[PDB]
Amino acid sequence: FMRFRRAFGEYSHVVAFNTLLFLMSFTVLCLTPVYSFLPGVYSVIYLYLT
Amino acid sequence: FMRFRRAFGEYSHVVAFNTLLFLMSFTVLCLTPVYSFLPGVYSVIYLYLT
């Protein structure tokens, strides 16, 4: 984490959350084909959390 | 963008807008031969925006 903070300057904070949200969305999309409940409730949770 | 900000010192801000305006003007000049309306209205918009 120190090595990561050495680069990317001030924008490391923006990059980290953008990557984490993308990873979470990718995981949700991967779990979509079996669990059909996710697209609605996860979207509502994301709207609440944002 | 971090790599670009590493160089050019304090004048990166002046260089960026100067390059963007030059690119926009070049695009407008490229669209000139077909759309004859551009030289006047774009000049007025540029004067307003400056």
CSV table of N, CA, C and O in Angstrom, one decimal:
chain,number,residue,atom,x,y,z
A,1,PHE,N,0.8,-1.2,0.0
A,1,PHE,CA,0.0,0.0,0.0
A,1,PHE,C,0.9,1.3,0.0
A,1,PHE,O,0.5,2.3,-0.6
A,2,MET,N,2.0,1.2,0.7
A,2,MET,CA,2.9,2.4,0.7
A,2,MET,C,3.5,2.5,-0.7
A,2,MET,O,3.6,3.7,-1.2
A,3,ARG,N,3.8,1.4,-1.4
A,3,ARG,CA,4.3,1.5,-2.8
A,3,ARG,C,3.3,2.1,-3.7
A,3,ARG,O,3.6,2.9,-4.6
A,4,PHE,N,2.0,1.6,-3.5
A,4,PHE,CA,0.9,2.2,-4.3
A,4,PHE,C,0.7,3.7,-4.1
A,4,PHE,O,0.5,4.4,-5.0
A,5,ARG,N,0.8,4.1,-2.8
A,5,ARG,CA,0.6,5.5,-2.5
A,5,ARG,C,1.8,6.3,-3.0
A,5,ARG,O,1.7,7.6,-3.1
A,6,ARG,N,3.0,5.7,-3.3
A,6,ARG,CA,4.1,6.4,-3.8
A,6,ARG,C,3.8,7.0,-5.2
A,6,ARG,O,4.2,8.1,-5.5
A,7,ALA,N,3.0,6.3,-6.0
A,7,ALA,CA,2.6,6.8,-7.3
A,7,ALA,C,1.2,7.3,-7.3
A,7,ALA,O,0.5,7.4,-6.2
A,8,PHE,N,0.7,7.7,-8.4
A,8,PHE,CA,-0.7,8.1,-8.7
A,8,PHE,C,-1.0,9.5,-8.0
A,8,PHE,O,-2.1,10.0,-8.2
A,9,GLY,N,0.0,10.0,-7.3
A,9,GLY,CA,-0.1,11.4,-6.8
A,9,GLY,C,-1.3,11.6,-5.9
A,9,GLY,O,-1.5,10.8,-4.9
A,10,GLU,N,-2.1,12.6,-6.1
A,10,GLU,CA,-3.2,12.9,-5.3
A,10,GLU,C,-4.4,12.1,-5.7
A,10,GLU,O,-5.3,11.9,-4.8
A,11,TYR,N,-4.4,11.5,-6.9
A,11,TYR,CA,-5.6,10.8,-7.4
A,11,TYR,C,-5.7,9.4,-7.0
A,11,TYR,O,-6.6,8.7,-7.4
A,12,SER,N,-4.8,8.9,-6.1
A,12,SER,CA,-4.9,7.5,-5.6
A,12,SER,C,-6.2,7.3,-4.9
A,12,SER,O,-6.8,6.2,-5.0
A,13,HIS,N,-6.6,8.3,-4.1
A,13,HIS,CA,-7.9,8.1,-3.4
A,13,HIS,C,-9.1,7.9,-4.4
A,13,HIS,O,-10.0,7.1,-4.1
A,14,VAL,N,-9.1,8.7,-5.5
A,14,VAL,CA,-10.2,8.5,-6.4
A,14,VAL,C,-10.0,7.2,-7.2
A,14,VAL,O,-11.1,6.5,-7.4
A,15,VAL,N,-8.8,6.7,-7.4
A,15,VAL,CA,-8.6,5.5,-8.2
A,15,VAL,C,-9.1,4.3,-7.3
A,15,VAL,O,-9.7,3.3,-7.8
A,16,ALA,N,-8.8,4.3,-6.0
A,16,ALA,CA,-9.0,3.2,-5.2
A,16,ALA,C,-10.5,2.9,-5.1
A,16,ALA,O,-10.9,1.7,-5.3
A,17,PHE,N,-11.3,3.9,-4.8
A,17,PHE,CA,-12.8,3.6,-4.7
A,17,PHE,C,-13.4,3.3,-6.0
A,17,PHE,O,-14.3,2.5,-6.1
A,18,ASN,N,-12.9,3.9,-7.1
A,18,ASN,CA,-13.4,3.6,-8.4
A,18,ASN,C,-13.1,2.1,-8.8
A,18,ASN,O,-13.9,1.5,-9.4
A,19,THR,N,-11.9,1.6,-8.4
A,19,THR,CA,-11.6,0.2,-8.6
A,19,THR,C,-12.4,-0.7,-7.7
A,19,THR,O,-12.9,-1.8,-8.2
A,20,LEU,N,-12.6,-0.3,-6.5
A,20,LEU,CA,-13.4,-1.2,-5.5
A,20,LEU,C,-14.8,-1.3,-6.0
A,20,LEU,O,-15.4,-2.4,-6.0
A,21,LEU,N,-15.5,-0.2,-6.4
A,21,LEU,CA,-16.8,-0.2,-6.8
A,21,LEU,C,-17.0,-1.0,-8.1
A,21,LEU,O,-18.0,-1.8,-8.3
A,22,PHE,N,-16.0,-0.9,-9.0
A,22,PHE,CA,-16.0,-1.7,-10.2
A,22,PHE,C,-15.9,-3.2,-9.9
A,22,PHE,O,-16.6,-4.0,-10.5
A,23,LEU,N,-15.1,-3.6,-9.0
A,23,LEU,CA,-14.9,-5.0,-8.6
A,23,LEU,C,-16.2,-5.5,-8.0
A,23,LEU,O,-16.6,-6.6,-8.3
A,24,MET,N,-16.8,-4.7,-7.1
A,24,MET,CA,-18.1,-5.1,-6.5
A,24,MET,C,-19.2,-5.3,-7.5
A,24,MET,O,-19.9,-6.3,-7.5
A,25,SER,N,-19.3,-4.4,-8.5
A,25,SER,CA,-20.3,-4.5,-9.5
A,25,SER,C,-20.0,-5.7,-10.4
A,25,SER,O,-21.0,-6.4,-10.8
A,26,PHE,N,-18.7,-6.0,-10.7
A,26,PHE,CA,-18.4,-7.2,-11.5
A,26,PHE,C,-18.8,-8.4,-10.7
A,26,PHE,O,-19.3,-9.4,-11.4
A,27,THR,N,-18.5,-8.5,-9.4
A,27,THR,CA,-19.0,-9.7,-8.6
A,27,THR,C,-20.5,-9.8,-8.7
A,27,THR,O,-21.0,-10.9,-8.8
A,28,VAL,N,-21.2,-8.7,-8.5
A,28,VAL,CA,-22.7,-8.8,-8.5
A,28,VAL,C,-23.2,-9.3,-9.9
A,28,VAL,O,-24.1,-10.1,-10.0
A,29,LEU,N,-22.6,-8.8,-11.0
A,29,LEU,CA,-22.9,-9.2,-12.3
A,29,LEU,C,-22.6,-10.7,-12.5
A,29,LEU,O,-23.3,-11.4,-13.2
A,30,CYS,N,-21.5,-11.2,-11.9
A,30,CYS,CA,-21.2,-12.6,-12.0
A,30,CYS,C,-22.2,-13.5,-11.2
A,30,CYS,O,-22.4,-14.6,-11.6
A,31,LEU,N,-22.7,-13.0,-10.1
A,31,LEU,CA,-23.7,-13.7,-9.3
A,31,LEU,C,-25.1,-13.6,-9.9
A,31,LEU,O,-26.0,-14.2,-9.4
A,32,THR,N,-25.3,-12.7,-10.9
A,32,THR,CA,-26.6,-12.5,-11.5
A,32,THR,C,-27.3,-13.7,-12.0
A,32,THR,O,-28.5,-13.9,-11.7
A,33,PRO,N,-26.7,-14.6,-12.8
A,33,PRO,CA,-27.5,-15.6,-13.6
A,33,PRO,C,-28.2,-16.6,-12.7
A,33,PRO,O,-29.2,-17.2,-13.2
A,34,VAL,N,-27.8,-16.8,-11.4
A,34,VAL,CA,-28.5,-17.7,-10.6
A,34,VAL,C,-29.5,-17.0,-9.6
A,34,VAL,O,-30.6,-17.4,-9.4
A,35,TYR,N,-28.9,-15.9,-9.0
A,35,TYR,CA,-29.7,-15.1,-8.0
A,35,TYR,C,-30.3,-13.9,-8.8
A,35,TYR,O,-29.6,-12.9,-9.1
A,36,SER,N,-31.6,-14.0,-9.0
A,36,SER,CA,-32.3,-13.0,-9.8
A,36,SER,C,-32.7,-11.8,-8.9
A,36,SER,O,-33.2,-10.8,-9.4
A,37,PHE,N,-32.6,-12.0,-7.6
A,37,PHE,CA,-33.0,-10.9,-6.7
A,37,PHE,C,-32.0,-9.8,-6.7
A,37,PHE,O,-32.4,-8.6,-6.4
A,38,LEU,N,-30.7,-10.0,-7.1
A,38,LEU,CA,-29.7,-9.1,-6.9
A,38,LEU,C,-29.9,-7.8,-7.7
A,38,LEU,O,-29.7,-6.7,-7.2
A,39,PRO,N,-30.3,-7.8,-9.0
A,39,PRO,CA,-30.3,-6.5,-9.8
A,39,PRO,C,-31.1,-5.4,-9.2
A,39,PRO,O,-30.8,-4.2,-9.3
A,40,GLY,N,-32.2,-5.7,-8.4
A,40,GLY,CA,-33.0,-4.7,-7.8
A,40,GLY,C,-32.5,-4.3,-6.5
A,40,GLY,O,-32.3,-3.1,-6.2
A,41,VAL,N,-32.3,-5.2,-5.5
A,41,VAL,CA,-32.0,-4.9,-4.2
A,41,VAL,C,-30.5,-4.3,-4.1
A,41,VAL,O,-30.3,-3.4,-3.4
A,42,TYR,N,-29.6,-4.9,-4.9
A,42,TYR,CA,-28.3,-4.3,-4.9
A,42,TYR,C,-28.2,-2.9,-5.5
A,42,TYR,O,-27.5,-2.1,-5.0
A,43,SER,N,-29.1,-2.6,-6.5
A,43,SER,CA,-29.1,-1.3,-7.0
A,43,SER,C,-29.7,-0.3,-6.0
A,43,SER,O,-29.2,0.8,-5.9
A,44,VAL,N,-30.7,-0.7,-5.2
A,44,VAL,CA,-31.2,0.1,-4.2
A,44,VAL,C,-30.2,0.4,-3.1
A,44,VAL,O,-30.0,1.5,-2.6
A,45,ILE,N,-29.5,-0.7,-2.7
A,45,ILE,CA,-28.4,-0.6,-1.7
A,45,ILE,C,-27.3,0.4,-2.2
A,45,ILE,O,-26.8,1.2,-1.4
A,46,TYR,N,-27.0,0.3,-3.5
A,46,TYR,CA,-25.9,1.1,-4.1
A,46,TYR,C,-26.4,2.6,-4.1
A,46,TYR,O,-25.6,3.5,-3.7
A,47,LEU,N,-27.7,2.8,-4.4
A,47,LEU,CA,-28.2,4.2,-4.4
A,47,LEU,C,-28.2,4.7,-3.0
A,47,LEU,O,-27.9,5.9,-2.8
A,48,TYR,N,-28.5,3.9,-2.0
A,48,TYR,CA,-28.5,4.4,-0.6
A,48,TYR,C,-27.1,4.7,-0.2
A,48,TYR,O,-26.8,5.7,0.5
A,49,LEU,N,-26.1,3.8,-0.6
A,49,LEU,CA,-24.8,4.0,-0.1
A,49,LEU,C,-24.0,5.1,-0.7
A,49,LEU,O,-23.1,5.7,-0.2
A,50,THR,N,-24.4,5.5,-2.0
A,50,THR,CA,-23.6,6.5,-2.7
A,50,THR,C,-23.6,7.8,-2.1
A,50,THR,O,-22.8,8.7,-2.4
B,1,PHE,N,-2.1,11.6,-16.7
B,1,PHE,CA,-2.2,13.0,-16.2
B,1,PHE,C,-1.3,13.3,-15.1
B,1,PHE,O,-0.7,14.4,-15.0
B,2,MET,N,-1.0,12.3,-14.2
B,2,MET,CA,0.0,12.5,-13.1
B,2,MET,C,1.4,12.6,-13.7
B,2,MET,O,2.2,13.5,-13.3
B,3,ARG,N,1.7,11.8,-14.7
B,3,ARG,CA,3.0,11.9,-15.4
B,3,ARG,C,3.1,13.2,-16.1
B,3,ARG,O,4.2,13.8,-16.1
B,4,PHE,N,2.1,13.7,-16.7
B,4,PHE,CA,2.1,15.0,-17.4
B,4,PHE,C,2.3,16.2,-16.3
B,4,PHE,O,3.1,17.1,-16.6
B,5,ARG,N,1.6,16.1,-15.2
B,5,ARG,CA,1.8,17.1,-14.1
B,5,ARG,C,3.1,17.0,-13.5
B,5,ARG,O,3.6,18.0,-12.9
B,6,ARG,N,3.8,15.9,-13.6
B,6,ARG,CA,5.2,15.8,-13.1
B,6,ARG,C,6.1,16.7,-13.7
B,6,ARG,O,7.0,17.3,-13.1
B,7,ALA,N,5.9,17.0,-15.0
B,7,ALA,CA,6.8,17.9,-15.8
B,7,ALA,C,6.0,19.2,-16.0
B,7,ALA,O,4.9,19.4,-15.5
B,8,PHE,N,6.7,20.2,-16.7
B,8,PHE,CA,6.1,21.4,-17.1
B,8,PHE,C,5.9,22.4,-15.9
B,8,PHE,O,5.5,23.5,-16.1
B,9,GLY,N,6.2,21.9,-14.7
B,9,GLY,CA,6.2,22.8,-13.6
B,9,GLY,C,4.9,23.5,-13.3
B,9,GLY,O,3.8,22.9,-13.3
B,10,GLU,N,5.0,24.8,-13.1
B,10,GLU,CA,3.7,25.6,-12.8
B,10,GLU,C,2.9,25.9,-14.1
B,10,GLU,O,1.7,26.1,-14.0
B,11,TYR,N,3.6,25.8,-15.3
B,11,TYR,CA,3.0,26.2,-16.5
B,11,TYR,C,2.1,25.2,-17.2
B,11,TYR,O,1.7,25.4,-18.3
B,12,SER,N,2.0,24.0,-16.6
B,12,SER,CA,1.1,23.0,-17.1
B,12,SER,C,-0.3,23.4,-17.3
B,12,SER,O,-1.0,23.1,-18.3
B,13,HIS,N,-0.8,24.2,-16.4
B,13,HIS,CA,-2.2,24.8,-16.5
B,13,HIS,C,-2.3,25.7,-17.7
B,13,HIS,O,-3.3,25.6,-18.4
B,14,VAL,N,-1.3,26.5,-18.0
B,14,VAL,CA,-1.3,27.4,-19.1
B,14,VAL,C,-1.2,26.6,-20.4
B,14,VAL,O,-1.9,26.9,-21.4
B,15,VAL,N,-0.4,25.5,-20.4
B,15,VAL,CA,-0.2,24.7,-21.6
B,15,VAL,C,-1.4,23.9,-22.0
B,15,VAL,O,-1.8,23.8,-23.1
B,16,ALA,N,-2.1,23.4,-21.0
B,16,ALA,CA,-3.3,22.5,-21.2
B,16,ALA,C,-4.4,23.3,-21.9
B,16,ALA,O,-4.9,22.8,-23.0
B,17,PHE,N,-4.8,24.4,-21.4
B,17,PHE,CA,-5.9,25.2,-22.1
B,17,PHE,C,-5.4,25.7,-23.4
B,17,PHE,O,-6.3,25.8,-24.4
B,18,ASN,N,-4.2,26.1,-23.6
B,18,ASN,CA,-3.7,26.6,-24.9
B,18,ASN,C,-3.7,25.5,-25.9
B,18,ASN,O,-4.1,25.8,-27.1
B,19,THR,N,-3.4,24.3,-25.5
B,19,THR,CA,-3.5,23.1,-26.4
B,19,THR,C,-5.0,22.8,-26.7
B,19,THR,O,-5.3,22.5,-27.9
B,20,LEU,N,-5.9,22.8,-25.7
B,20,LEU,CA,-7.3,22.5,-26.0
B,20,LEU,C,-7.9,23.5,-26.9
B,20,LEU,O,-8.7,23.1,-27.8
B,21,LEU,N,-7.7,24.8,-26.7
B,21,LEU,CA,-8.3,25.8,-27.6
B,21,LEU,C,-7.7,25.7,-29.0
B,21,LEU,O,-8.5,25.8,-30.0
B,22,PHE,N,-6.4,25.4,-29.1
B,22,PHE,CA,-5.9,25.2,-30.5
B,22,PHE,C,-6.5,24.0,-31.2
B,22,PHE,O,-6.8,24.0,-32.4
B,23,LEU,N,-6.7,22.9,-30.4
B,23,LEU,CA,-7.4,21.7,-31.0
B,23,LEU,C,-8.8,22.0,-31.4
B,23,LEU,O,-9.2,21.6,-32.5
B,24,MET,N,-9.5,22.7,-30.6
B,24,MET,CA,-10.9,23.1,-30.9
B,24,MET,C,-11.0,24.0,-32.2
B,24,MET,O,-11.8,23.8,-33.1
B,25,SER,N,-10.0,25.0,-32.3
B,25,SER,CA,-10.0,25.8,-33.4
B,25,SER,C,-9.6,25.0,-34.7
B,25,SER,O,-10.1,25.3,-35.8
B,26,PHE,N,-8.7,24.1,-34.5
B,26,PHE,CA,-8.3,23.2,-35.7
B,26,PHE,C,-9.5,22.4,-36.1
B,26,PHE,O,-9.7,22.2,-37.4
B,27,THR,N,-10.3,21.9,-35.2
B,27,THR,CA,-11.5,21.1,-35.6
B,27,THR,C,-12.5,22.0,-36.3
B,27,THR,O,-13.1,21.6,-37.3
B,28,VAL,N,-12.7,23.2,-35.8
B,28,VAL,CA,-13.6,24.1,-36.4
B,28,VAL,C,-13.2,24.5,-37.8
B,28,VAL,O,-14.0,24.5,-38.8
B,29,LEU,N,-11.9,24.7,-38.0
B,29,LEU,CA,-11.3,25.0,-39.3
B,29,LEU,C,-11.5,23.8,-40.3
B,29,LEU,O,-11.7,24.0,-41.5
B,30,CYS,N,-11.3,22.6,-39.7
B,30,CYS,CA,-11.6,21.4,-40.6
B,30,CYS,C,-13.0,21.3,-41.0
B,30,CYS,O,-13.3,20.8,-42.1
B,31,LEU,N,-14.0,21.7,-40.1
B,31,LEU,CA,-15.4,21.6,-40.5
B,31,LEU,C,-15.8,22.8,-41.3
B,31,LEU,O,-17.0,22.8,-41.7
B,32,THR,N,-15.0,23.8,-41.6
B,32,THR,CA,-15.3,25.0,-42.3
B,32,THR,C,-15.8,24.7,-43.7
B,32,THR,O,-16.9,25.3,-44.1
B,33,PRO,N,-15.1,23.9,-44.6
B,33,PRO,CA,-15.5,23.9,-46.0
B,33,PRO,C,-16.9,23.5,-46.3
B,33,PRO,O,-17.4,23.8,-47.4
B,34,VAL,N,-17.6,22.8,-45.5
B,34,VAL,CA,-18.9,22.3,-45.8
B,34,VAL,C,-19.9,23.2,-45.0
B,34,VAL,O,-20.9,23.7,-45.6
B,35,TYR,N,-19.7,23.4,-43.7
B,35,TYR,CA,-20.6,24.2,-42.9
B,35,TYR,C,-20.0,25.7,-42.9
B,35,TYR,O,-19.1,26.0,-42.2
B,36,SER,N,-20.7,26.5,-43.6
B,36,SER,CA,-20.3,27.9,-43.8
B,36,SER,C,-20.8,28.8,-42.6
B,36,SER,O,-20.4,29.9,-42.5
B,37,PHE,N,-21.7,28.2,-41.8
B,37,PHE,CA,-22.2,29.0,-40.6
B,37,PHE,C,-21.2,29.1,-39.5
B,37,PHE,O,-21.2,30.1,-38.7
B,38,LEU,N,-20.2,28.2,-39.5
B,38,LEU,CA,-19.3,28.2,-38.3
B,38,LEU,C,-18.4,29.4,-38.1
B,38,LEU,O,-18.3,29.9,-37.0
B,39,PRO,N,-17.8,30.0,-39.1
B,39,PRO,CA,-16.9,31.1,-38.9
B,39,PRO,C,-17.4,32.3,-38.1
B,39,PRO,O,-16.7,32.9,-37.3
B,40,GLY,N,-18.7,32.6,-38.2
B,40,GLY,CA,-19.3,33.7,-37.5
B,40,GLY,C,-19.8,33.3,-36.1
B,40,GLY,O,-19.4,33.9,-35.1
B,41,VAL,N,-20.7,32.2,-36.0
B,41,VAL,CA,-21.3,31.8,-34.8
B,41,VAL,C,-20.2,31.3,-33.8
B,41,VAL,O,-20.3,31.5,-32.6
B,42,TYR,N,-19.3,30.5,-34.3
B,42,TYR,CA,-18.2,30.0,-33.4
B,42,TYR,C,-17.3,31.1,-32.9
B,42,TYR,O,-16.9,31.1,-31.8
B,43,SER,N,-17.0,32.1,-33.7
B,43,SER,CA,-16.3,33.3,-33.3
B,43,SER,C,-17.0,34.0,-32.2
B,43,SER,O,-16.4,34.4,-31.2
B,44,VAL,N,-18.3,34.2,-32.3
B,44,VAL,CA,-19.1,34.9,-31.3
B,44,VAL,C,-19.1,34.0,-30.0
B,44,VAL,O,-19.0,34.6,-28.9
B,45,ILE,N,-19.3,32.7,-30.1
B,45,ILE,CA,-19.3,31.9,-29.0
B,45,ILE,C,-17.9,31.9,-28.3
B,45,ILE,O,-17.8,31.9,-27.0
B,46,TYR,N,-16.8,31.9,-29.0
B,46,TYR,CA,-15.5,32.0,-28.5
B,46,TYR,C,-15.3,33.4,-27.7
B,46,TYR,O,-14.7,33.4,-26.6
B,47,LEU,N,-15.8,34.5,-28.3
B,47,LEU,CA,-15.7,35.8,-27.7
B,47,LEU,C,-16.5,35.8,-26.4
B,47,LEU,O,-16.0,36.3,-25.3
B,48,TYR,N,-17.7,35.1,-26.4
B,48,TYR,CA,-18.5,35.1,-25.1
B,48,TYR,C,-17.8,34.2,-24.1
B,48,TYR,O,-17.8,34.6,-22.9
B,49,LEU,N,-17.2,33.1,-24.5
B,49,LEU,CA,-16.6,32.1,-23.6
B,49,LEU,C,-15.3,32.6,-23.0
B,49,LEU,O,-14.9,32.2,-21.9
B,50,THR,N,-14.5,33.5,-23.7
B,50,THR,CA,-13.2,33.8,-23.3
B,50,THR,C,-13.2,34.7,-22.0
B,50,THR,O,-12.1,34.8,-21.4
